[model samples]
Structures are given as structure tokens and as C-alpha cells.
Target: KSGHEIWEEFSMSFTPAVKEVVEFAKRIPGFRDLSQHDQVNLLKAGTFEVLMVRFASLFDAKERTVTFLGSKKYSVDDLHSMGAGDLLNSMFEFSEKLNALQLSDEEMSLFTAVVLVSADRSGIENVNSVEALQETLIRALRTLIMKNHPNEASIFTKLLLKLPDLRSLNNMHSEELLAFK
Candidate 1:
């Protein structure tokens, strides 16, 4: 049996965030230069990953709660009962890992950009071009992280490691979407 209202609520919350992600993607240097088809592919593949990172702030590890639609607070129990199951819990775990890093706004933004361009490159028409753009974003991200967190050199590397985790979450998220439909 499919869980109902919670899935609807989840989609409602993510809808505007999806729009914001597109705007954010367009602002990234060289993003708009890509072919329109490539741009669409990247957004389709990466939006969930970027939103996962962006919405990390909505989860409060200390309170064991997540805020939804920018206002309503749902406890772990509430979400679990509402069919959130493992994905929500895993997201909270990831949120804790990332929130503990305490990255600044600039670092977060640059990292999100890297996540976007670094999205699945398989179907991309100009894979080399996309890779080049991702390389530039990664370089800038690493530089900023290293400079700001001089004593914590591993922060940049650690952030890179989360890309795979995001991809996993994205996969699970899609399963949920299909099941919901």
C-alpha cells in the first residue's frame, strides 16, 4: 500500500525549491553557456542532490526534528509514521554530518554548484565541457575551504566524499517518486 498525504506534502515543499534550484543553477558561471539540452539533463539529475544539501538546515539533530514548508516541525517518529522510512532518517544522518562541518555561506554555495555540474554526465552531449566547468567549480571550492579552514584541511576532501552519498539518496528518492505516482 502507498502512503499518501505526507508524500503530497513533501512534493509541495520541494516544488518551489526546485524552481529556486534552477535559478541558482543559471547563476553559476558558465552554466548558461551549456547547450539547453545538457542544462536540462543536469538539472533533472542533480536537483535532488542540491536540494538535499540546501535543505540540510531544515533538520535539527539536537531536536531530532525536521522543519517542513519552512514552518511545520515534524519529529522523527512523525515522519517515520508518515512513510518517510529510511530515506528521511538517512537524510538526517547526512544533515548531521554536513551541519557539523559548519561551512560558511560561500563554501556552501560553491559546493552546491559543484554538485550541480558534477551530476551524472553519462547522457550529456558535451561531457568534456561539463567536466571542465565542474573542475573549475571544484578548484574554487577547494581553494575557499582551504583558506577559510586552514587548520582543517580535510573539510574540502570530506565534502567531495559526500557526492556519492547524495547520489545514493537521489536514487532512493526517485524510487519513492515512482512509487508515489
Candidate 2:
């Protein structure tokens, strides 16, 4: 397939995850309490970040390969040739560091919840309420991290630092999505 075709295929592959993210969001405590407009805005901006968190395991750093939706593994080079550019590699790096943290399933879920709530709040109508939810999620994540990884307190800080990196990846991906059109 040509680059455009490859991009379209790759973009559509994420459709399933977007739906799952919605279901996941509804389960989050206090998430349903947000206005419908706020809920949609949050999902629009943060779905990719949550997807990145959920899909981190799909990238095998040791093997240097990424498994797509169909379970077929593609090497980083192969993906690059298939029209995946810097954003793909960037996500790989993000996945590598995130997987290195070795969070348990519960921790990972909570962290994704935090990622969703911590999304870009500039356009949100209820900024105070959103921030309140963010704080609640962050506290839960920090406590879980501290309890599970007692010796590595820095891990909590490390996870917080990834938020900005996720934002960068999101911005690059938005550009890629637009270019596909």
C-alpha cells in the first residue's frame, strides 16, 4: 500500500480502542458527573493518550517490534517504510519507558484514568471540577505506585513526567491524522 493507504489503515485500526476508551471512561469514579460536553471534550483530546497507555505492551522493546490490531508484528523499520514516521518511533520510546516501569494491571488502569482526566483543560467548561477529578486520580495513582514499588519512589515522579511527553505525541499524531486527509 502507498503511504496514504497505510496511514488510513493505521488510523482506522484505532477505532476499536476509541470505543473501549469510552466504556472505560464511564466506569471512572466521578467521570460521569462531568457535563456531557466536558465528557466529549475530554475523550476527544485524551483518547489517544489512554490508548497509548493501554497499547504500551504491544511494543516489544527487546524485539524492537510493534504488534498491530491483527496481531501481526511489524519491525520499527517496516513501520517507518509503511509511512509511519517520527511519531511511531516516539510512541515506541514512550512505550519502552512506560513498560520499564512495570506497573501492575490495577496501577496501569488507574494511571490511564488519570491520563484521561489530566487532558488539556483549557477549553473545558468546568475547569475546577476537572482539576478536582485529576487530583483525585493522581493521588490514587501515587499511592498505588508507592505501595507496589516501595523502593522506587521516583517512579511516581517519572510517571507524572510522562504526561507532557504524551501530549507531545498527541500533537504529532493530530498532525499525522490531518495530513492523511
Candidate 3:
């Protein structure tokens, strides 16, 4: 599903407390003027903070395990692996409620793009095998093209060009590696 669609689904599942926090955030000054990226960060930070406060109350004693999963990265497959589809659905529901208060599309897009990139990177980090790592890195590079920051792209490009050196560095153990003389 598209990011917006996913967000919409997630927000619908929020509890009253979560919905309250989202409502409170709309009252914060300059929230509307902030860039899409910043708005997303604000919402994410608020959601996490509110969750932390209510965490103990939400725990299920009978289940013997925490049913709640924190926010998942954007990949549907990875999120499914982590059991976060429901959480994502809840988040989107909250977003939909907030949208009624005039959330900007530009800010939403920026937030979603950044999050998806981060999620894609997370998937890369999970690969244990060298071949899988290389394949994932290629995917990361393709996604980076859509990232918001030019400087981030340039730095990432430089890092990609130096992958051979990075691989060599990775091979060195802390105890065995020599310091510059």
C-alpha cells in the first residue's frame, strides 16, 4: 500500500489517549508553518512520548507478553515481520484525525519519504550475508534518489563510491587493527 494509505489505516486504531495527544499537538504554535519533515518529527515524538506515559497501563497481564509494538519502518514485509501492522494502522488513523485540523500535504510527503528511506536502510542493516548486504545497499541507493536533502545524497554517494574501503575496514578487528604511526 502507498504510504498515505498506510498512515490512514494506522490512525484509525488509536485509543482515546492517543487521540487526545494528537488533538493537543494541533494547538501547538507554529506547527502548521513547519516543514513537512519537521511536522512528522513533531508528531512522532509526541506519539512516542504519550505512549511512554501510558505504557504501564496498556500492558496485558493475562497475555504474559506486551501486545504493543512500537512504530515500524515503512516496508510492509519488515513491519509484518515485527508485528507492527496494527500499530501502523493506528498511527494512520491518528493522522487522519489530525488532518481534519489542516495538516499540510507537503509536510506529510516529506515525513513519509524520510521514514520510508529510514525503513529501507533498516532492512539493509538486517542482512547478515555479504551478498545480501550488497543487494540491499543497491536498493538503498535507488531510494536515496528521492530523499529530501541534497547534502545527504552527496555524502551517501561518496560513501557508496568508497564501499571497497568500507568493506576492508569492516574486516579489521578492534584488537588486531593497527593505529597510524
Candidate 4:
């Protein structure tokens, strides 16, 4: 199979684990209280963090393969190490928790879209211009966030308008920008 095929197969197998992490993230104390924009941001951060942790544990560039290391590479173990495992376990432990609160089909689609955007943004490797890709990612994320959260639509829309200029900042090395904070 091609590399893309292998990755897809890996991703398909990884879904349950990823879903568990997403479910767990939903239950965090601030998760429910956040504005729609915040909720999306929270999920973005949590999901990315979980992926980072799991990826680190399983990453084997030499083998061009990921090692599960524990209880299936993409299973509870991955999230567990990231402190998201309990959230996942609790989700399955009580189905009612999610049954009463669920995203509609459209909302779910938007969520998936944002996820893909975020994943693509973070997955770039060996690209000559990471900033350009990062800017594109930021723009994609801003657009999707606007679409998903109408209440904050203006905020994101304004941000989207500024993306071209922001893209210029992408070339700024991390150290140069770190001082701004």
C-alpha cells in the first residue's frame, strides 16, 4: 500500500481513541461554560495536545511507523498519559452524559472541518516555509471558527481580514516573536 493508504488505515484505527479524547475534553469544568468560540478553541488545544503526547510516545521516524507502546497505539493509553484518559473513561462509563448533549449533524461537520484544518496546519514537515503554511492554517481556522460560532462571527471575520498581513508574520522566527509576549 502507499504511504497515504497506510496513514489512512492508521487514522481509521485511531478514531476510537481520538473520539475518547474529544469526549473527555467536553467534560472539563470550563468546557461547558466557554463561548462557542472558546469551546472550539478548547477542543482544538486539547485534541492537539493529546495527539502530541501520543505521537511522541509512538513516533518512530526510522521505521516510518508508530508504536502503540501500551494497550494499542491509539487506544486509551495514548490519552491516558496525556491526562485525558479519565475523561474518556468517564464518557463510556456513563453514556447518558453525552446522550443528552450532542452536536447536530451540521455542528459535527464543522467540528470535523476545524479538526482537519488544525491537523493539516500542524502536520507540515520539511516545508521550506512553515510560516506560510501556518498562516494558511490560521486563516482556515478563523474562517471555520466564524462559521461555527455565529455569536463571535464579527470577531473572527475581522481576524480573517487581517490574515494576509498576519501571514507575513509567519516568517518571523519563534524567538523574535516570543519577546512580544
In every candidate, how many clashes are there? 0, 0, 15, 1
What lDDT does each candidate get? 0.83, 0.83, 0.36, 0.38
| lDDT for model 2 | 0.83
Query: What's the TM-score of each model vs. the native?
Result: 0.89, 0.89, 0.22, 0.30
Quote model 1's TM-score. 0.89
lDDT of model number 3: 0.36
For residues 90-112, write the lDDT of model 3, one tens digit per residue: 33333333333221344333232
* lDDT tens digits, residue span 91-179, model 1: 78898789989899999999999999989887689999899999999999988988999999999999989999898888777555423
Best lDDT among the predictions, by candidate number: 1
Off by over 4 Å in 4: 60-65, 68-181
Candidate with more favorable, higher TM-score: 2 or 4: 2
How well does candidate 2 match the true structure in TM-score terms?
0.89
Per-residue error (Å), model 4, residue 134:
23
Worst 10 residues of 2 by lDDT: 172-181
lDDT of 2 by residue, 88-129 (tens): 777788998999999899999999999999888866899899
